Ligand binder design. Structure first.
Ligand SMILES: Cc1ccc(C)c(OCCCC(C)(C)C(=O)O)c1
Ligand SMILES: Cc1ccc(C)c(OCCCC(C)(C)C(=O)O)c1
Ligand code: NA
Ligand code: NA
Lengths: 116, 116, 116, 116
C-alpha cells in the first residue's frame, strides 16, 4: 500500500470513521484530475487507494471531507475540508501515510514517508 | 480588520516571516478567483487583506506558500503549499483569524472567530 | 514582557477565556516551586507574569488547567491539565510566548521566542 | 495492550525512533510514583508498558523525553519533554493510545480511547 490515510477525532478521542477522502493529481494542463477516493474504516484508516504502478510521479492533493464528517455528527464546523498537497515519488517510489487530527475549528496533518 | 492571517514556524520557534499568502473566493462556476494577497510581516502577521464591505458571505481559500518559505531557509519541505478552505458566515462573529503552525512534514491550522 | 501565555479553543474557534495558568520554577532539589500565575483574559492571553529581573535562566513549567476550562463549558475532558516544560536560555532571544491550542482529547503547543 | 504510545517526527516525516517514555501514577500521598517506562521501536511505537491487571484506576503521567530525542539527533530543542496527564480506567478498563507529533519548538498530542 503506497498511499494510506489515517484520521483521528480530537473531540471524541477516537478514529474518525466514515470520512470521505478524494485524491487528485495535477494534470499536464495544470488542472486537478480525479485520482482515487474512498472512506475511512472503523479504525480511521483508508487503505487500497492506489497501486505502485498507478501511483506515478506527480503533484497530488489529498482532500479530506471534514465538513461532511462533522455535519453527519450534528456539528457545524469551520472548514470545508482539509487538504494535503505534495509532490510524490520524485526520487523513485515511496510509501506515504497521510495522517489528520480533526477538531471543529482546527485540524492538523502530518506525513510519514518510507522507502521500500 | 475582518480577516487576518498569522503564521508560525515550529522548527525555529519564531514567526514565519515573508511568507506569501493568497486568498481566493469561490465563484458561481466553482472556480477560485483571486481575492487578496500579501506577505507576512516580521511578526508573522498579514493585515489589511480586505474590508467589511468587500468580505461577503461565501467560500474562501487561503493558500500559504510554505514551500518557498522552507526553501529560503535551506530546508527541504514536503508540501507544495498549505490551504485553509472555509465558509464566511454573517451569523457568527465578525472577525476571522486564520493561524497556521508550520513544520517541514506537518502543519496545523486553527480559526479564531470573534466579535470586537 | 519576558513571558506571555496564549490559549486557544479548537472546538469553539475562540480564545480560551478565564483559564487558570500556573508557572513553576525548578529548584535545586528538583522540586517545582511556585513562580507566577493568573487567568487568561478575554483575548486568551496572560500578560504580566514576571519581569526581566525575576525571570532568570532555568527550567520552568507552565501548567494550564484545561480540565476546569472544559467542565465550565459542559464538556467532558481527557486531560487533568496541560504542561509546558522548557529551559529559559539567555543566549537566545529575550521574549517567550507559550501558545496552546486545546481540544477535549488533544492539545498542541508551540513556543515563539523573539527579540523586540 | 491497554496502554500504548506512538511518536512521529514532523521534521523528518518519519516515526520518532528510540524515544524514551516514562509513565508515572499519582500515589495516595500525591507524589508521582514510577509506573512503567520503555522506548519507541523502529515504527515509533511503544508496546508492552503494562498489563490489564496492573493498569488500575488512577491519574497517570506519560512523559515523553523529547529533549533527549532531539539532542541525540544533534538538535537543540525548546522543551524538556512532552507530558500527557490523565485519569484512566475510571469507568472500568479502557485501552489508551497516546500519540505525539514532535518538532523542535512544538509538539502535539492526542489520545485514542477504546472499550474492549
Ligand atoms: C499528535 C498528532 C498530531 C497530528 C496528527 C496528524 C496526528 O496523527 C495521528 C497519527 C496516528 C498514527 C501515529 C499515524 C497512527 O495511528 O499509527 C497525531
Ligand atoms: C499551539 C498552536 C498550534 C497551531 C496553531 C495554528 C497555533 O496558532 C498560533 C496562535 C497565535 C495567535 C494566538 C493567533 C496569535 O499569535 O495571536 C497554536
Ligand atoms: Na526525479
Ligand atoms: Na469510577
Amino acid at each position: 500500500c503506497p498511499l494510506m490515510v489515517k484520521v483521528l477525532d480530537a473531540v471524541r478521542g477516537s478514529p474518525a470513521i466514515n470520512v470521505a477522502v478524494h485524491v487528485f493529481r495535477k494534470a499536464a494542463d495544470d488542472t486537478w484530475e480525479p485520482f482515487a477516493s474512498g472512506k475511512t474504516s472503523e479504525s480511521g484508516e483508508l487503505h487500497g487507494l492506489t497501486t505502485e504502478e498507478e501511483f506515478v510521479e506527480g503533484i497530488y492533493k489529498v482532500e479530506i471531507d471534514t465538513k461532511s464528517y462533522w455535519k453527519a455528527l450534528g456539528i457545524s464546523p469551520f472548514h470545508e475540508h482539509a487538504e494535503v498537497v505534495f509532490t510524490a515519488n520524485d526520487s523513485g517510489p515511496r510509501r506515504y501515510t497521510i495522517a489528520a487530527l480533526l477538531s471543529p475549528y482546527s485540524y492538523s496533518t502530518t506525513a510519514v514517508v518510507t522507502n521500500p
